[PDB]
Design an enzyme around this catalytic site. Structure first.
Site, short mmCIF file in Angstrom:
data_model
loop_
_atom_site.label_atom_id
_atom_site.label_comp_id
_atom_site.label_asym_id
_atom_site.label_seq_id
_atom_site.Cartn_x
_atom_site.Cartn_y
_atom_site.Cartn_z
CB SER A 10 -11.98 9.42 -1.87
OG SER A 10 -11.58 8.26 -2.52
CD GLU A 58 -3.11 -0.72 0.10
OE1 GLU A 58 -3.05 0.36 -0.57
OE2 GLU A 58 -3.91 -1.64 -0.19
CG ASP A 75 -6.67 5.40 -0.87
OD1 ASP A 75 -7.81 5.51 -0.40
OD2 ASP A 75 -6.42 4.54 -1.75
CG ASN A 82 -11.03 6.08 0.11
OD1 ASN A 82 -12.24 6.46 0.20
ND2 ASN A 82 -10.33 6.37 -0.85
CG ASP A 138 -13.82 7.91 -5.30
OD1 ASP A 138 -12.87 8.62 -4.84
OD2 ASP A 138 -14.16 6.85 -4.67
CG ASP A 172 -17.38 -1.90 7.41
OD1 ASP A 172 -18.12 -1.47 8.29
OD2 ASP A 172 -17.48 -1.61 6.19
CG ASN A 188 -8.67 6.90 -4.39
OD1 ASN A 188 -7.64 6.27 -4.67
ND2 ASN A 188 -9.07 7.09 -3.15
#
Ligand code: NA
Length: 129
Positions: free
Chosen positions: A50, A35, A52, A59, A48, A101, A46
């Site tokens: 967003s 990562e 990270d 995120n 979209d 989650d 990203n």
């Protein structure tokens, strides 16, 4: 800060990741390697909109607040910038919430693509733990 492989393992172990939700320490080290290359300062944008943040590339659409991800949540209740520190506490705490989650460590694409199913114990070999 750019961690060494065993330093970070040790740090992760002290913060309780080791076998957290059944994921052995090597999984977490492997995920951080792919990562962020063990760099607490890594950021990535990203499509979209967003971003990270940090060693585990958490995120902003769901987990931390960056002030520039419209309509997003902040489930970890932390500014994203805090995830970039030399002290991994806050990243580890938020990572515990993500992995619980429902999708486990699959929420980390690079874990899923580069660590899942591999000999993850290699990542902690040699280390005084
Ligand atoms: Na957010």
């Amino acid at each position: 800060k750019v961690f060494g492989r065993c330093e970070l393992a040790a740090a992760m172990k002290r913060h309780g990741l080791d076998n957290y939700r059944g994921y052995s320490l090597g999984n977490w080290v492997c995920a951080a390697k792919f990562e962020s290359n063990f760099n607490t300062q890594a950021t990535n944008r990203n499509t979209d909109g967003s971003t990270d943040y940090g060693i585990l590339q958490i995120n902003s659409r769901w987990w931390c607040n960056d002030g520039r991800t419209p309509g997003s949540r902040n489930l970890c209740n932390i500014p994203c910038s805090a995830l970039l520190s030399s002290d991994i506490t806050a990243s580890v705490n938020c990572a515990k919430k993500i992995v619980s989650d429902g999708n486990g460590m699959n929420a980390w694409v690079a874990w899923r693509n580069r660590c899942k199913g591999t000999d993850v114990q290699a990542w902690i070999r040699g280390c005084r733990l």
